[PDB]
Design a protein around this ligand. Structure first.
Ligand SMILES: [Cl-]
Ligand SMILES: [Cl-]
Ligand SMILES: [Cl-]
Ligand SMILES: [Cl-]
Ligand SMILES: [Mg+2]
Lengths: 231, 224
């Protein structure tokens, strides 16, 4: 029953000082941080180490996708860095995912959570047909999420719409990391067509990745506490 | 000039990697930095390789939504790398966005190369991820998608090279791993270049050699 902040703040800064100036405004007890391909390619593991020094848990969002040997060694490198969560493309296949899980076994209970990416949020039918996928996107997402589960991974990134059905098929403990949700207290957070954070969590999301609504706030600390209180 | 050999640097230790690079001349080869060394040692390692005079293929196979993939590719251009790759399975829009963001970096911009079907994927692996096409046919589809997006070439095997070169043209670059300088089942460097490969990615045959600079010199002389 330890502290488990549900909001993961996306850090997508092209400047290190701006990024750290933002982190200075928030508390590690109230959120987690996501470091993606942009900030990692620009600033590397030293940036992640600085976030760790500040006491934050980090989701290293690099979506590794390579042959099993290479993908597993990259995941091992994430474990050497001491990250809380790391992701891989399920499209890399079952053997790639299983090899990545296997290599983390020696890191014990503190090992990174290993999460699969199914179909990127930017992709719709047309984009999928372009890369040779003819099945309906929802069915393909379920295929890839099931592949991840069967490879022994800890969870997947998924939309709020997908969450309940994924828990039903894959288990109550399978971790669901959900992007695209806006604070109810923000502008366009009152819109009904997209789930609020409370609705997303009720639907099965375990974590909510949120970016600009927080990083652009005058008082991101206030926005986080409001999101948190509502969950 | 244009060294055709790209040496794979897959070390889990910085000192060991640098001791190896100390043995070779930057005029005789290029270097590949992948997900393992980049995750462990980051852009500072790539900058050290540039300081030593080497051109680098940053092999991180970016695969994300177009905005994010393009920002990662821009980060590669900011680092000054010679080549960077992305997964063609990220789709045409992701690849085109990555090319567009490189436009202002001029002629010195990183070459942008697509990854088609990973070497690890045979028919059974492909079925598992929702692909029912023969792997060779899927490679051709994804390589064509890469060219359509305006990219500079693809990573491809010795088996795939001549067919891709014939179909997609002389100027579309083919970067080929798995080659071994002289079993007869694996192509030699001269055989691969003749088959259409533009660059060769070579690992252990060079990194584990008693005299890596001699292996490189022998490979380079065999290509004419
Ligand atoms: Cl806070
Ligand atoms: Cl492998
Ligand atoms: Cl996008
Ligand atoms: Cl089948
Ligand atoms: Mg504070």
């Amino acid at each position: 029953a330890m502290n488990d902040p549900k909001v993961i703040v996306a850090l997508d800064y092209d400047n290190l000082a701006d990024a750290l100036a933002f982190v200075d405004k928030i508390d590690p007890s109230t959120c987690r941080l996501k470091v993606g391909k942009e900030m990692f390619t620009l600033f590397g593991p030293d940036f992640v180490r600085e976030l760790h020094k500040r006491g934050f848990s980090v989701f290293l969002d690099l979506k590794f996708h390579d042959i099993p040997n290479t993908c597993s060694k990259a995941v091992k490198a994430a474990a050497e860095l001491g990250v809380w969560m790391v992701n891989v493309h399920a499209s890399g296949g079952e053997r790639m995912m299983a090899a990545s899980r296997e290599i983390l076994e020696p890191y014990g209970k503190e090992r990174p959570l290993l999460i699969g990416v199914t179909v990127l949020t930017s992709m719709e039918s047309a984009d999928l047909q372009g890369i040779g996928i003819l099945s309906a996107p929802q069915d393909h997402v379920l295929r890839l999420a099931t592949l991840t589960k069967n490879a022994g991974l800890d969870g997947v990134v998924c939309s709020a719409q997908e969450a309940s059905l994924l828990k039903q098929h894959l288990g109550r403990e399978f971790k669901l990391v959900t992007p695209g949700i806006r604070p109810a207290g923000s502008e366009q957070g009152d819109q009904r067509r997209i789930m609020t954070p409370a609705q997303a969590i009720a639907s099965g999301s375990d974590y909510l990745v949120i970016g600009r609504p927080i990083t652009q706030a005058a008082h991101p600390e206030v926005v986080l506490e409001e999101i948190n209180s509502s969950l």
